[PDB]
Design a binder for these strands. Structure first.
Length: 121
RNA sequence: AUUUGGUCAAUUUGAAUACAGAGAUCAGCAGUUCCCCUGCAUAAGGAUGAACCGUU
């Protein structure tokens, strides 16, 4: 009830919590992806992969493999796959955070490489 | 120095019920006009091709 009241108050005032300013890609605006404007999907999910090898049964075996930064142009179908080598992560700490930064850097580099015409919106 | 700018509406009444008052948001497509291209028709108007002789 209290929460509801708070919400109502907010509405009245038109205060809102940050969230994110940019508009989310969604089922609603999925069709927006395939207009003439140039775009690039980026994925940092595969940058620091650890592996714990597991078969159909699930037997244990430890290792830490190479990663990648999947960066895809859905118009042209190009895939600027920056392969992150495992040597990067040797003697490092706060690893996940570092990975994100690395990914960002890579993206920036890619952008720089692309000319003004081919660059993404 | 005092005070007016402060009456919820709606319903049931002969004060009670109500309690602020009753589709939103996102997205297609077609039409309307003008333009451009393309194919066809209609008129008109060209331009040109095609062996070899014809008809009382």
């Amino acid at each position: 009830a209290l929460y509801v009241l708070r919400e109502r108050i907010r509405k009245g005032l038109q205060i809102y919590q940050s969230s994110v300013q940019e508009p989310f890609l969604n089922s609603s605006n999925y069709a927006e992806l395939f207009n003439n404007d140039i775009k690039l999907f980026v994925d940092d999910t595969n940058v620091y992969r650890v592996t714990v090898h597991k078969t159909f049964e699930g037997n244990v075996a430890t290792k830490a493999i190479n990663g990648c930064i999947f960066t895809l142009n859905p118009k042209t179908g190009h895939l600027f796959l920056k392969i992150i080598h495992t040597s990067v992560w040797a003697g490092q700490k706060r690893l996940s955070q570092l990975a994100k930064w690395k990914t960002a850097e890579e993206v920036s580099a890619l952008v720089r490489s692309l000319p003004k015409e081919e660059q993404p919106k």
